[PDB]
Amino acid sequence: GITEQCCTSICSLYQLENYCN
Amino acid sequence: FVNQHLCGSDLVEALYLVCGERGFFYTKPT
């Protein structure tokens, strides 16, 4: 669910990085 | 990096610099 949260507001590369493989 | 908007194409862009040649998730919510 990153599209239903990172596309409704702004996120942070800090966390944005936890979505990698 | 003082405000990043992610969504669709831009979603992978931000996840791109973080992931790099390692592949990201970019999974759909529903």
Curated annotation (Swiss-Prot), chain A:
Taxonomic superkingdom: Eukaryota
Disulfide-linked positions: C6-C11
Listed name of the protein: Insulin A chain
Annotated organism of origin: Homo sapiens
Gene: INS
